[PDB]
Scaffold this active site. Structure first.
Site: not given
Ligand SMILES: [Zn+2]
Ligand SMILES: O=c1[nH]cnc2c(CCNCC3CCCCC3)c3[nH]c(NCCc4ccccc4)nc3cc12
Ligand SMILES: O=c1[nH]cnc2c(CCNCC3CCCCC3)c3[nH]c(NCCc4ccccc4)nc3cc12
Ligand SMILES: [Zn+2]
Lengths: 356, 356
Positions: B91-94, B130, B177, B292, B297
Site C-alpha cells: 500500500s505504500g505505507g510501510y 495500514d 496489527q 540447487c 549453479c
Molecule cells: Zn543455484
C-alpha cells in the site's frame, strides 16, 4: 577444424567478407568483437544470442585479479566465464600505458610475459606486445616507437612459438604502428610480414586524430598488409567508423562504445544514437529502435528503459547493453550481406544518409 | 479463471498447501513473492524461471517515479515491466513511514489514494492501507494504532469496492496489527473479518522483536484469522523464519533478503548462507550450492562469482540474485511437497539440523 584459416568468399572494392575457422568456432568477417571477467551486465548466452562469434578478453584487468595463474589453475578463461567460442586477448599494453624500456613496461610487463599471460588465460587469438604511439607524434618519436614495437613483435612471435600447446592451438596477430606517416607505416608492414603472423592489426589509430585523418591513414596503410590475412582495426569504434573502415579493407573490430555508452543511456539506432535519459522518451511506447530484431526491442519500450536508467537500475544497463551489442552485430551482418551481394557501396551511402 | 479462489489441497498440523487461482494465473501456496520498476538485476523470464508465480510490486517507489498515473497511461505495471502473472502491490505505507493523522500520512497518502494508486498500477492483489506499529509498543499505543488501522481497513474496502473494474478483477487483503498483544490481535482479527477480505495478512511483525517473539505471537494470532482464506506474513524473511511460520499457518511471504543479500555477497545454501566474498572461495570450483537446480549453479563456480562480486561487476549481482531467488522457490517447493505427503514436521527438523 583447423587452428586458423581465413577464407574470403566475396569482395567489393577494398571490402571483403568471409570466415575465420579456428578450433573453437567460426568467425564471420567483417566481425565486431564485444569487449569484456565478463562482458559487462551480460551472460555469455546473451552475448552469443546477439550474434557475437568471438569476444575480446580484457587481459589487463584479469592479469590484476584474479590473476593469470589463478585462472589457468581454474581451467582457463573459457571455462571460468562460460564462453566456449574464440577469445581474442589484448596484450595488456594499451591500458597499462593508459617506466618504459626495451625490456618492456614497468608499472613489469614485457612481450614474453604478455604472451605467457595470454597463454595462461587460454586465448585463441593472441596479440603481440606493442606500444600504441601517442598522437600527435613527430616523425622521430613515431619512428623510434614503431621500431621498438617491431622488435617487441619478434619477441612475441618467438615467445608464442616457444610454447607448443599455444602455437598448435592458438593464432598470433602482429600490430602495425607508425602514427600517421606512410613511410613508417610501410616499414612497419614490411617488418611484420617478414616475421610472419596469422593476422595483422592496424595499431596507433583511434588516438585523437579524428575520422578524416584515420581514414586517410587507413587508405594507404591497409593495402600494405598481406591481402590474404585478416585486418584488425584496434579500438574502433562508432558505426560510421566501422563502415568507412570496412570500405578500406578492415575485417575485424573491437570497441567499448556499445557497452560503456549503453550503461550511460546511449542507445544505437538506424536513425542515429539516442540518449534514453531524455525526457522526450518518458512515455514513448516504441522500442529503442524501429527495426532491431533484439529481444529488448521485442519486449520493452523506450519509456521503461528510460525510467530504469533514470533510476540507476541494473536492469537498465542490462537491456541497454544487450540492445547495443545486438545493434552492432546487426550492423556487421548487413555489412557482410551487402558485400556478399556486391551492394556495399550503396549500403554505406544509405546507412549514412539515414544515420545522419 | 475466477477473480480469486483459494483451495487447500493438503494439511499437516497448522500448515497448509494449495492454490490461489486468479485471472492472471495460479499461485502455489505456501508462496514466496520476490520483491521488485523491476526485480533488481533480473528479467521477468528469469524470475519466472526460478519458479515465482507472483511478484510483489513496490508501490512506494513507483508512486514516486515514474508515477502511478504515467504507468496507467502506459498500459499498467504488467505491460510496463513485462510480467503477465499476478502482482501483489503493497500500500505504500510501510516505506513512507520508514505527519500522521486520521486522514492518512503526509510526507499525503491515505487509504483512498493508496487504493487508487494500486488500481492505476493494475495490481491483482491489493493491500489495505495500514500502519505498522513500532516495536516495542505499550498496550495503549498498540491499541490506538490498531484501531486506526481497522478504520483505515474499512476505508480501503469501500475504496476498492467503489471501482467496478478493480473489484471485479482484483482481490483485497486486510492486515492484522496489535503488536505482540493477544487481546489486541483478536480485536483486530474480529474487525477485519466483519469487514471481509479475500486474504488476511499478519502485520506488525518482523519489526525488531526477534524470532522467538515473532513465533509466539504467530502462535495465537494466525488461528484468529479465517481458516479458509490465505494468510500473509509481511516482510518475512530468512529460510528458518519461513519454515517456522508455515508451521504456524502462513501461506504467503515477501522479503527483500534474497535480492539485497544477493548483491551484498550473501548466497543461501542448504548448509546455511555463505558470503561469497570470503577468500576461501577464490579457487572453489563448486557451485554456490550442492543441490540447487538453478542455472547459475549449473554453469558458474563459486570462484567466478567471488571474483565478480569482489570486482563490483553487475554480472555478480545478477547471478547471486538469480541463485538466491531460485533457492527461496526451491525452499517453498520442498515445503509444499513435504506438506502434501504429510512429512513437513520431519522436513522442518531435517532442514534445521543441516542449515544450522
Ligand atoms: Zn543455484
Ligand atoms: O595500437 C594499439 N595497440 C594495442 N591496442 C590498441 C588499442 C586497444 C584496443 N581495445 C582493446 C581493449 C587502441 N584503442 C584505440 N582507441 C580507442 N586505439 C588503440 C590502439 C591500440
Ligand atoms: O504491518 C505491516 N504492514 C505493511 N507492511 C509491512 C511490511 C512491509 C512488507 N514488505 C513490503 C516491501 C513489513 N516488513 C517487516 N519486516 C521486514 N515488517 C512489516 C510489517 C508490515
Ligand atoms: Zn534492440
Amino acid at each position: 577444424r583447423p587452428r586458423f584459416s581465413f577464407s574470403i568468399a566475396a569482395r567489393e572494392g577494398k571490402a571483403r567478407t568471409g570466415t575465420i575457422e579456428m578450433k573453437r568456432g567460426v568467425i564471420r568477417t567483417p566481425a565486431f568483437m564485444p569487449v569484456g571477467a565478463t562482458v559487462k551486465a551480460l551472460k555469455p548466452e546473451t552475448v552469443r544470442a546477439t550474434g557475437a562469434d568471438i569476444i575480446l578478453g580484457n587481459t589487463y584487468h584479469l592479469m590484476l585479479r584474479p590473476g593469470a595463474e589463478r585462472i589457468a589453475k581454474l581451467g582457463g578463461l573459457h571455462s571460468f566465464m562460460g564462453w566456449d567460442r574464440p577469445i581474442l586477448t589484448d596484450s595488456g599494453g594499451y591500458q597499462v600505458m593508459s617506466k618504459q624500456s626495451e625490456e618492456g613496461v614497468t608499472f613489469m610487463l614485457s612481450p614474453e610475459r604478455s604472451i605467457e599471460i595470454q597463454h595462461l588465460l587460454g586465448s585463441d587469438i593472441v596479440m603481440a606486445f606493442d606500444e600504441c604511439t601517442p598522437y600527435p607524434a613527430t616523425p622521430s618519436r613515431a619512428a623510434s616507437s614503431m621500431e621498438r614495437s617491431m622488435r617487441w613483435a619478434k619477441r612475441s612471435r618467438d615467445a608464442f612459438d616457444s610454447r607448443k600447446e599455444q602455437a598448435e592451438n592458438a593464432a598470433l596477430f602482429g600490430i602495425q604502428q607508425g602514427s600517421v606517416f606512410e613511410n613508417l607505416r610501410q616499414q612497419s608492414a614490411d617488418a611484420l610480414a617478414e616475421i610472419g603472423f596469422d593476422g595483422y592489426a592496424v595499431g596507433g589509430l583511434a588516438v585523437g586524430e579524428g575520422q578524416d585523418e584515420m581514414f586517410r591513414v587507413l587508405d594507404f596503410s591497409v593495402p600494405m598488409l598481406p591481402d590474404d590475412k585478416p585486418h584488425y582495426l584496434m579500438g574502433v569504434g562508432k558505426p560510421d567508423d566501422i563502415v568507412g573502415a570496412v570500405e578500406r579493407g578492415i575485417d575485424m573490430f573491437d570497441c567499448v562504445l556499445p557497452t560503456r555508452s549503453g550503461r550511460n543511456g546511449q542507445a544505437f539506432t538506424w536513425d542515429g544514437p539516442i540518449n534514453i535519459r531524455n525526457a522526450r522518451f518518458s512515455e514513448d511506447l516504441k522500442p529503442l529502435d524501429s527495426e532491431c530484431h533484439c529481444a529488448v526491442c521485442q519486449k520493452w519500450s523506450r519509456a521503461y528503459i528510460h525510467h530504469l536508467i533514470r533510476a540507476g537500475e541494473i536492469l537498465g544497463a542490462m537491456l541497454m547493453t544487450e540492445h547495443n551489442i545486438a545493434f552492432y552485430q546487426q550492423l556487421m551482418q548487413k555489412i557482410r550481406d551487402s558485400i556478399s551481394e556486391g551492394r556495399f557501396s550503396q549500403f554505406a551511402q544509405d546507412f549514412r544518409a539515414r544515420y545522419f
